[PDB]
Amino acid sequence: ASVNFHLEPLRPWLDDPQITEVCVNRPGEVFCERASAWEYYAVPNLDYEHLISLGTATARFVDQDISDSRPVLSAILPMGERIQIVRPPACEHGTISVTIRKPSFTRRTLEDYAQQGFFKHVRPMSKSLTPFEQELLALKEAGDYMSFLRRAVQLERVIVVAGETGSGKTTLMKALMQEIPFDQRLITIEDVPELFLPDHPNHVHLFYPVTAATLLRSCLRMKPTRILLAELRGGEAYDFINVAASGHGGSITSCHAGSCELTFERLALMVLQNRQGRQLPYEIIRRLLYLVVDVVVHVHNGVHDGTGRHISEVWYDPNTKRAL
Amino acid sequence: ASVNFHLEPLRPWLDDPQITEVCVNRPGEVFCERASAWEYYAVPNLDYEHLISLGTATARFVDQDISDSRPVLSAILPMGERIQIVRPPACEHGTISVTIRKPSFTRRTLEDYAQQGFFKHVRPMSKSLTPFEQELLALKEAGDYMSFLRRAVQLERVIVVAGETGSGKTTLMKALMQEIPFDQRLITIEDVPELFLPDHPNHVHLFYPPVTAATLLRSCLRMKPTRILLAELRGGEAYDFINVAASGHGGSITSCHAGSCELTFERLALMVLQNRQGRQLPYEIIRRLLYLVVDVVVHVHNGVHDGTGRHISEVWYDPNTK
Amino acid sequence: DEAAVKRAASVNFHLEPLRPWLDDPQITEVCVNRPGEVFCERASAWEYYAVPNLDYEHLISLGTATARFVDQDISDSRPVLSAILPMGERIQIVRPPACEHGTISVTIRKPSFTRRTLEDYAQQGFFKHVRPMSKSLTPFEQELLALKEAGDYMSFLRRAVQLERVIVVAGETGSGKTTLMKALMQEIPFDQRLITIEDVPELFLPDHPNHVHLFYPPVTAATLLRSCLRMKPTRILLAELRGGEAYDFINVAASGHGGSITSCHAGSCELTFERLALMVLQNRQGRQLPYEIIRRLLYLVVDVVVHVHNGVHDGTGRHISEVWYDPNTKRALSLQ
Amino acid sequence: ASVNFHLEPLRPWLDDPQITEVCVNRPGEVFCERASAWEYYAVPNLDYEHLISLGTATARFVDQDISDSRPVLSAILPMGERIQIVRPPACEHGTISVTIRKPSFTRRTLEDYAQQGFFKHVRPMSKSLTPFEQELLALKEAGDYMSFLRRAVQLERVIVVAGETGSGKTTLMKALMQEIPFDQRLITIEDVPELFLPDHPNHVHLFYPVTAATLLRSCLRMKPTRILLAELRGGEAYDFINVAASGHGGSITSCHAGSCELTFERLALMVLQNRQGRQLPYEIIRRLLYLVVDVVVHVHNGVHDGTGRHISEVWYDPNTKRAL
Amino acid sequence: DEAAVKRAASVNFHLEPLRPWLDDPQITEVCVNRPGEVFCERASAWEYYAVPNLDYEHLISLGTATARFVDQDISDSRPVLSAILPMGERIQIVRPPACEHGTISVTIRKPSFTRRTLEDYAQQGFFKHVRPMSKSLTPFEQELLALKEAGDYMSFLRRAVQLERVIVVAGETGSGKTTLMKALMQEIPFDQRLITIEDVPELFLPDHPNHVHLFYPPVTAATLLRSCLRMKPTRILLAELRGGEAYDFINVAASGHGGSITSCHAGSCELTFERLALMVLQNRQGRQLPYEIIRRLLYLVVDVVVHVHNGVHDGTGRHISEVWYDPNTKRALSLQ
Amino acid sequence: ASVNFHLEPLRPWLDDPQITEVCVNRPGEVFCERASAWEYYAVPNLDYEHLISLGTATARFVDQDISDSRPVLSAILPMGERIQIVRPPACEHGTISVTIRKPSFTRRTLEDYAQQGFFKHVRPMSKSLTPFEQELLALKEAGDYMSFLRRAVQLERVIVVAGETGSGKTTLMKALMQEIPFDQRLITIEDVPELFLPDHPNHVHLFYPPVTAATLLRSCLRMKPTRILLAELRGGEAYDFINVAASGHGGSITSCHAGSCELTFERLALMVLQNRQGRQLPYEIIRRLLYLVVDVVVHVHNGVHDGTGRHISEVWYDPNTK
């Protein structure tokens, strides 16, 4: 009842059966998902103070605490909605991230599905690529790497930006992010603010001094279109694999590595830092990386020959992704 | 004697030798198994309050407690019946679930079994694929995926509905559940109420907010279900799921967030490694357990880029691996 | 001195009705399964004797006296007792929550006094049948193997029990495992000593006078299995393998207790071994074993797996799907 | 100085350079080793009380405590002697086991060794057995198992007595122990007193309610001719292997097992209970058992045929001990 | 507001003598290795500039001001500092216990401002030499391989350094490893930026003006290796691999810092990899790696091992026993 | 300046460029290495008290402590010299051990090395067995075990003396030590003083009663020994032993209680598994490390039964494994 009172400013979209998700990224606004598309609404009556009290109320509704020491909260609402709340240390200051995912009521028979054309698009078996994969392979083969990278982001390929320390990985990552359609929901996970999103109104900045791993798990309950982890460095690599395997595509991240092949090499080493990652045979880890990582872009300092920063290699091998 | 008193409304079925199981899913009704088939009986004088008091009496009989914080109870009654009681944090509100399994007393000699045909049906065990499996393989081969899925449910294949979050897995899972014969006993395990069963009168809804999906799966072993319907596999329960399915509980339907059919088995393995026992298993053994237990994986795709919309991208079925 | 002497005299007092069997050098084991009777092991053969002046209360008192002699308690919350008696006898006592109500189980092991030198052993023919130098081949497991390959599964199962093979009855719940297990138990010779371990009284033995029913509601199936090692059973009949006991089962069987029959919920023969292995991993010591070793232990210990299926789906009815028997892998492995 | 005072009654044998070891098994006596042979001396002035105070004095000489809670003590004496002390819980009541091992001063050149015939007895390489091994193999082949067992004990083979529960293993073990020459030093490790030694004056009974494992390690510092562990049951199996691999031969022990092959099977499982035992691949454990265990005698109940207790099998395979 | 503004102004004050380089858009890195000079990276090339009005005390003050701006301390017990300056520059500062006495090391990384879209990258030719599609074969490591097989080890070693191969100088203690390492360092082009990590000042660089000597006596060889990632060295010269640093070394090298030369006490080339693997296991994260993966990392990262032996035994004198070079296994492995 | 003061009696050798190492093993003497050869010098004014004060001064210079409970010290002097100091719990009584290693300053180009013959001796690395190895194999083959053992010590093979307790391993180990050239620097590590060296003036006796055999082995790395003589391998030190031997310290002689040569490697592996790092190594890798590091195993047998008496039963040598 204390929770339901604090959910009052969200009633229009909470009661609208056409809407599947109700998000608050910062005071004053709401983003709602209606048929897989996001809509903006200006709700001024929704102060930062209001959202802070919303958090506490929800915490007290079940065995739990909300904090500064415990900024990430998961809860189930009276009417069956799931709510994820991230507070000010773990998310951008002055903001309180809320994601409410409404229960699914849709009832169709297998016959109803049939008439919707639900069984018309099953890919039979073939090692044959999708039209999108063919397209990317052609652009690469043509040597048009700019178009390749733009299309890869549009076709929601998982992209790892690789490079030697001080290579400009973050900058390239930022360039790639500008190719993400502006109406998609983005969540950034970082330690120091760099991945700003001026053209992507529907976004949440998450911060770890709470780890990158816990934030990645938080994202699963946050309905992002893409997750943008600034950098893979240790045990999170396993969680990253897991998140991407879960269906969260279109991710862009970065990794210090001396080449494309060394990227997969170093990512494997990071997986072995996870308690679950350690249980996986090495060959399985390497297979997971290939199933999940679509593109590796390596940025090179240009020093054995004074060429300056340049891209040394772009790795893309969907034929091993198809087969394996 | 306190438990026996509360058991009195069930005497007609508890004393009938033809009956092996006596269930109460909600106040006012009883379901009984006679020769592997369930029968409904309306029992008016079996209030919600009567069942709560039944629970406490049975708890005290074994020197245990049962309330909101201890909602799952296992006990053995003095006449040898085993009783499983789930109360309403862990089961549907205003509802108590009771399952009484009666002792087996039948005596038959080796000669009795033979003349009744107990040794006549011993199959060779050729890796040549059971009539049913050939039927399912033929449908997939023909590309009749609707009939395939209907038959799979009817043939009690273990089915995992896969897809990314918000791709309609639950809805498909619900569509597949409507293909389960209406006279079968069903138990749902979920954290949000979604898997409603309007056409399956014999059912129990179990809930987890310690009570977990894993404890609820273990509870199901003592509850005589025909199928177990776990809404979603997410962590350590995957191991318990494997174990339950390996124990001979077939016809399960569940879901799993995954980016493809292979990624489903890939993610399910990672979930098994979250279990204390699952961790002891070599990865190859986990992958082998999944193949022995999981018959079908249906992957749902949102069709965003190609503008295809909501569709099935792949159906995995390989009984030549099992 | 006196304190110990006083405590020794009380035990002896309650041992009085067993005095004849306890003093006879030709008797090695002395058992009481229930009020009014004793079973004694003569030359590896059991003999029945009626002792009416040996009621329930006598045995209760016997328990407590023996407990006190070790300074322990045989209460209803501590119903299993092991002790070494004044004359050197090992005694195991199980009381009424852990054994059949209105019964006490007593097993008295007796010490040697006769086999002191190697010359003694040779005199009573201990070195006479050392003839097996452990055959790399199959003895007349080939008889069993032929019956299986001839398809006569009824004879196979009867012979397997007679030949003391370890048998696991498998099937889904409600498939009739217990009933088949009981059918198989009727094939055990009626003069053999049997001990059942169950949660629910189901494995009744009308034709096996020398038996003890043990029960678990701390007392578990595992503690009861360990207790059996100190009773002198011919076979141990654990109703069902469900968790950590699986490891104790393996160790009981590997210690030379043949002819065990048990059950396990499983969807096939292969899924039986699969599920038994998971149960082993529930044990503190089972966890230390590599998976491949657990699977090897199962194959060394488990001779036959009979899987039961309810044919209601195809309309076949109650039948056996598969009988698993592979002494050749038991062989290879044990020789590997 | 407090230690040296308590070592006074032992001066004759401590200062005798001909003697390498000075043992006290119980109040009143001393056993000394002179040229690998033991000698008895009656020393009445050496009370139980004297030995208790000897222990404490030695404990206080270094960072340590002697107890009931800490009954096993290792120390190095002022003049370089090593002393092992076991007190009343861990050793037979009313006794205090002392073993003093004197430092080695012998100086020989390689030339001195040569004239002593030190290089005359090197076994070249052959898979050929020693005369003793040939002898045992012949007795076994002849079917004379009584003579085989007697000779095995005399030839200091490591013997495991196996059997089903209630088989008479201990009794056979006791029968085998009577074949040990009466002038050899014996140490028994058990939980309940059964392995009495009326004809072996030089002995120490060790007890665990301190484990069988810690007692086995204690034996290394106690100069036994043979170690007699009543029963192998868990992790000690590894320590047993280690002790036997160390050169301590002539051991006799027991193990519940359903056959000879099941003995090695069960012993392997016990090794896996040790923290170090777990590191060994299974094949290595099985190889260690074969290198260390010479004979397995299985005692059988005689029940499939009413034959009574008998020996079912005697396992002896030195040809796999030679090769592997 | 004001507090932060006041603290921002102090840093800028001490940044004044670097103002010309900091404001020039064509300059990307700005370094101070010692009082009186700056080195700046123009187009991946270093340039020397003399700045006399930039003494030791200036740099001390610069450190403290930057520390305060992050609210930290650059003391003699905390001599390594990382910070992000007001205009976005990353700055690494090492002071006098951890670097050469009477010197401070400053490295200022500068932010982009120009490469915002993919169109920008193409304009400055970032997509021009993506031509290597990573050859499964050997480029002109075949040149090195021929020199080794021709037996011209002197040319081989010179070329290996020029070709920026990772080189480990191996040998027993007192075999002259350090001297050979110094000989090999003279083969590094004099215009490359070098950073030495040592316990003992030995790796002097008279012919390499752009260098920083780092020292470990908490500051360790490992923390210094991590510090190097934020300076902008061409190569890192760790005097000796001894323990847990081996893992950081592997990660520095795998991150794209080619041309490293180091040493290791070992009795042969094979014993080098053997000992390096043991050092990796001294690392908290190194311990998580299976042994086979550690050995694979070593092969991916270490190009050449030169083993030195003192021929006093045979009377051969100071010589090289073996040169190990196997790009074919590096290859197979990285492609495996 | 406090350390420099106490260093003044060593100035002649600390300032001589031809000298690479300056050692003090006991009061009154110095040993210096000039061109890989040791030289003795009598230094009267270098009392036991002077060396204690040297230790403390050096400790304070690096802000550490040195007494009975902290007897091993490692430091770097201001002129770049590394100094290892062991004081008399951990080393012989009335004795302090000092080792000063001087910085290497030599500059040579690739051209300088070539003309001086630094690249001329690069061997093929054929698995065909070094002249010395053939010599040793021939002696064993001829059955001349005395000459074999003498040559092995001279050729600086790592030798493990094996046998059961009280079989005379120590005595043989001492006999083998007399075959080490008298001008080589030796360091013994023991818990009871037994490995006396009357004919080896340049030596240090290290003792362990925390100080262990393992810490003492690591100390030896900074002490410039020609050979390390660990009395006995018993536990976790085995790993450090392997590591020291793999680091290029050859000519080691040690002992190990074992019932045969194969049982020696068998027991040494078990000892390695007692080390925290040793535990991470697969067993096959431990066994391989032992074979790479251990050249000879001599087994001593008491000859009790056969009445043979004290003799060598087997000599293991297999350079075709290394």
mmCIF file of C-alpha atoms in Angstrom, chain F residues 100-254:
data_model
loop_
_atom_site.group_PDB
_atom_site.id
_atom_site.type_symbol
_atom_site.label_atom_id
_atom_site.label_comp_id
_atom_site.label_asym_id
_atom_site.label_seq_id
_atom_site.Cartn_x
_atom_site.Cartn_y
_atom_site.Cartn_z
ATOM 1 C CA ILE F 100 77.672 -9.073 -1.078
ATOM 2 C CA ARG F 101 76.908 -9.251 -4.800
ATOM 3 C CA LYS F 102 78.278 -6.269 -6.707
ATOM 4 C CA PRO F 103 76.503 -4.551 -9.612
ATOM 5 C CA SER F 104 77.419 -5.634 -13.115
ATOM 6 C CA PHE F 105 78.802 -2.685 -15.103
ATOM 7 C CA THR F 106 80.447 -4.353 -18.115
ATOM 8 C CA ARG F 107 79.562 -2.965 -21.550
ATOM 9 C CA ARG F 108 80.038 -5.130 -24.615
ATOM 10 C CA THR F 109 78.467 -4.847 -28.063
ATOM 11 C CA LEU F 110 77.278 -7.746 -30.209
ATOM 12 C CA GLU F 111 80.520 -7.369 -32.184
ATOM 13 C CA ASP F 112 82.633 -7.605 -28.991
ATOM 14 C CA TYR F 113 80.993 -10.899 -27.997
ATOM 15 C CA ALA F 114 81.520 -12.446 -31.445
ATOM 16 C CA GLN F 115 85.269 -11.746 -31.671
ATOM 17 C CA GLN F 116 85.637 -13.165 -28.136
ATOM 18 C CA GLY F 117 83.886 -16.392 -29.208
ATOM 19 C CA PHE F 118 80.464 -16.009 -27.568
ATOM 20 C CA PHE F 119 78.527 -17.461 -30.537
ATOM 21 C CA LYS F 120 81.004 -20.140 -31.630
ATOM 22 C CA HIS F 121 79.927 -22.833 -29.138
ATOM 23 C CA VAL F 122 76.175 -22.998 -29.824
ATOM 24 C CA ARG F 123 75.460 -26.738 -29.741
ATOM 25 C CA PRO F 124 72.861 -28.437 -32.113
ATOM 26 C CA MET F 125 70.900 -29.847 -29.137
ATOM 27 C CA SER F 126 70.729 -33.401 -30.372
ATOM 28 C CA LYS F 127 69.235 -36.015 -28.151
ATOM 29 C CA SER F 128 72.597 -37.882 -28.555
ATOM 30 C CA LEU F 129 74.141 -37.387 -25.023
ATOM 31 C CA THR F 130 76.940 -35.040 -24.070
ATOM 32 C CA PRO F 131 80.484 -36.478 -23.749
ATOM 33 C CA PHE F 132 80.134 -36.384 -19.935
ATOM 34 C CA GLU F 133 76.863 -38.276 -19.980
ATOM 35 C CA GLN F 134 78.350 -40.978 -22.210
ATOM 36 C CA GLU F 135 81.264 -41.228 -19.756
ATOM 37 C CA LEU F 136 78.934 -41.710 -16.789
ATOM 38 C CA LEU F 137 76.730 -44.160 -18.683
ATOM 39 C CA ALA F 138 79.804 -46.213 -19.628
ATOM 40 C CA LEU F 139 80.945 -46.481 -15.982
ATOM 41 C CA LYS F 140 77.511 -47.632 -14.822
ATOM 42 C CA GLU F 141 77.425 -50.088 -17.728
ATOM 43 C CA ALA F 142 80.886 -51.422 -16.753
ATOM 44 C CA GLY F 143 79.620 -51.782 -13.171
ATOM 45 C CA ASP F 144 82.268 -49.477 -11.729
ATOM 46 C CA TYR F 145 79.904 -47.821 -9.282
ATOM 47 C CA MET F 146 82.614 -46.233 -7.130
ATOM 48 C CA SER F 147 84.109 -44.395 -10.130
ATOM 49 C CA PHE F 148 80.589 -43.589 -11.302
ATOM 50 C CA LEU F 149 79.750 -41.826 -8.049
ATOM 51 C CA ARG F 150 83.078 -39.983 -7.925
ATOM 52 C CA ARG F 151 82.637 -38.818 -11.522
ATOM 53 C CA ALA F 152 79.000 -37.828 -10.939
ATOM 54 C CA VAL F 153 80.037 -35.487 -8.130
ATOM 55 C CA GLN F 154 82.893 -34.108 -10.202
ATOM 56 C CA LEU F 155 80.549 -33.619 -13.167
ATOM 57 C CA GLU F 156 78.137 -31.821 -10.804
ATOM 58 C CA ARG F 157 75.209 -34.207 -11.233
ATOM 59 C CA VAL F 158 72.311 -33.751 -8.847
ATOM 60 C CA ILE F 159 72.477 -36.765 -6.539
ATOM 61 C CA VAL F 160 69.838 -38.072 -4.161
ATOM 62 C CA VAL F 161 70.967 -40.637 -1.613
ATOM 63 C CA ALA F 162 68.048 -42.947 -0.853
ATOM 64 C CA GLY F 163 67.473 -45.661 1.723
ATOM 65 C CA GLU F 164 65.383 -46.556 4.727
ATOM 66 C CA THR F 165 65.950 -44.820 8.062
ATOM 67 C CA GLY F 166 69.224 -45.887 9.645
ATOM 68 C CA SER F 167 70.682 -47.266 6.450
ATOM 69 C CA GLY F 168 73.668 -44.889 6.423
ATOM 70 C CA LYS F 169 72.475 -42.283 3.875
ATOM 71 C CA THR F 170 74.122 -39.403 5.724
ATOM 72 C CA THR F 171 77.447 -41.252 5.843
ATOM 73 C CA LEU F 172 77.364 -41.933 2.096
ATOM 74 C CA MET F 173 76.301 -38.325 1.490
ATOM 75 C CA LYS F 174 79.370 -37.278 3.507
ATOM 76 C CA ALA F 175 81.576 -39.654 1.489
ATOM 77 C CA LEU F 176 80.227 -38.101 -1.718
ATOM 78 C CA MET F 177 80.874 -34.585 -0.395
ATOM 79 C CA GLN F 178 84.569 -35.384 -0.024
ATOM 80 C CA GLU F 179 84.640 -35.737 -3.826
ATOM 81 C CA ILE F 180 83.662 -32.067 -4.269
ATOM 82 C CA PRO F 181 86.747 -29.960 -5.119
ATOM 83 C CA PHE F 182 88.017 -28.224 -1.991
ATOM 84 C CA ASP F 183 87.967 -24.752 -3.556
ATOM 85 C CA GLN F 184 84.208 -24.728 -4.225
ATOM 86 C CA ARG F 185 81.811 -22.747 -2.045
ATOM 87 C CA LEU F 186 79.405 -24.996 -0.125
ATOM 88 C CA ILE F 187 76.270 -24.303 1.879
ATOM 89 C CA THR F 188 74.690 -26.971 4.064
ATOM 90 C CA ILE F 189 71.069 -26.849 5.183
ATOM 91 C CA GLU F 190 70.252 -29.086 8.135
ATOM 92 C CA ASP F 191 68.373 -29.368 11.440
ATOM 93 C CA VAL F 192 71.048 -31.446 13.191
ATOM 94 C CA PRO F 193 74.756 -30.605 12.676
ATOM 95 C CA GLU F 194 76.250 -33.580 10.839
ATOM 96 C CA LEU F 195 77.534 -32.418 7.460
ATOM 97 C CA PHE F 196 80.859 -31.059 8.715
ATOM 98 C CA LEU F 197 83.308 -29.782 6.094
ATOM 99 C CA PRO F 198 86.919 -29.941 7.414
ATOM 100 C CA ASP F 199 88.411 -29.775 3.898
ATOM 101 C CA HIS F 200 86.157 -27.067 2.465
ATOM 102 C CA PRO F 201 87.228 -23.750 4.064
ATOM 103 C CA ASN F 202 84.658 -21.723 2.057
ATOM 104 C CA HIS F 203 81.364 -22.890 3.565
ATOM 105 C CA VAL F 204 78.302 -21.843 5.560
ATOM 106 C CA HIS F 205 76.226 -24.134 7.765
ATOM 107 C CA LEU F 206 72.556 -23.095 7.762
ATOM 108 C CA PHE F 207 70.123 -24.418 10.378
ATOM 109 C CA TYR F 208 66.345 -24.649 10.798
ATOM 110 C CA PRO F 209 64.580 -25.522 14.083
ATOM 111 C CA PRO F 210 59.527 -19.081 10.939
ATOM 112 C CA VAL F 211 62.818 -20.400 9.533
ATOM 113 C CA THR F 212 62.454 -23.586 7.487
ATOM 114 C CA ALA F 213 64.521 -25.676 5.084
ATOM 115 C CA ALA F 214 62.511 -23.941 2.343
ATOM 116 C CA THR F 215 63.358 -20.385 3.417
ATOM 117 C CA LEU F 216 67.010 -21.449 3.741
ATOM 118 C CA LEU F 217 66.986 -22.809 0.185
ATOM 119 C CA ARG F 218 65.623 -19.476 -1.068
ATOM 120 C CA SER F 219 68.295 -17.701 0.983
ATOM 121 C CA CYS F 220 70.936 -19.756 -0.866
ATOM 122 C CA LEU F 221 69.906 -18.101 -4.168
ATOM 123 C CA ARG F 222 71.321 -14.824 -2.834
ATOM 124 C CA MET F 223 74.412 -16.425 -1.327
ATOM 125 C CA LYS F 224 76.554 -17.395 -4.405
ATOM 126 C CA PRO F 225 77.105 -21.102 -3.583
ATOM 127 C CA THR F 226 78.760 -23.533 -5.971
ATOM 128 C CA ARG F 227 76.641 -26.304 -4.471
ATOM 129 C CA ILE F 228 73.807 -26.550 -1.983
ATOM 130 C CA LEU F 229 73.806 -29.536 0.342
ATOM 131 C CA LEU F 230 70.370 -30.055 1.873
ATOM 132 C CA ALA F 231 70.697 -32.865 4.419
ATOM 133 C CA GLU F 232 67.247 -34.271 3.737
ATOM 134 C CA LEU F 233 64.112 -33.737 1.641
ATOM 135 C CA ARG F 234 60.999 -34.341 3.737
ATOM 136 C CA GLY F 235 58.103 -32.121 2.677
ATOM 137 C CA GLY F 236 57.235 -28.893 0.863
ATOM 138 C CA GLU F 237 60.934 -27.979 0.399
ATOM 139 C CA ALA F 238 61.068 -30.514 -2.432
ATOM 140 C CA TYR F 239 59.347 -27.917 -4.612
ATOM 141 C CA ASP F 240 61.869 -25.230 -3.647
ATOM 142 C CA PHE F 241 64.634 -27.753 -4.262
ATOM 143 C CA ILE F 242 63.329 -28.374 -7.781
ATOM 144 C CA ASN F 243 63.098 -24.628 -8.306
ATOM 145 C CA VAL F 244 66.638 -23.985 -7.061
ATOM 146 C CA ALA F 245 68.041 -26.817 -9.196
ATOM 147 C CA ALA F 246 66.056 -25.595 -12.234
ATOM 148 C CA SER F 247 67.537 -22.140 -11.634
ATOM 149 C CA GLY F 248 70.931 -23.572 -12.535
ATOM 150 C CA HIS F 249 72.374 -24.517 -9.149
ATOM 151 C CA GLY F 250 73.832 -27.950 -9.957
ATOM 152 C CA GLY F 251 76.036 -30.432 -8.100
ATOM 153 C CA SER F 252 73.520 -30.747 -5.267
ATOM 154 C CA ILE F 253 73.628 -33.790 -3.015
ATOM 155 C CA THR F 254 70.702 -34.615 -0.747
#
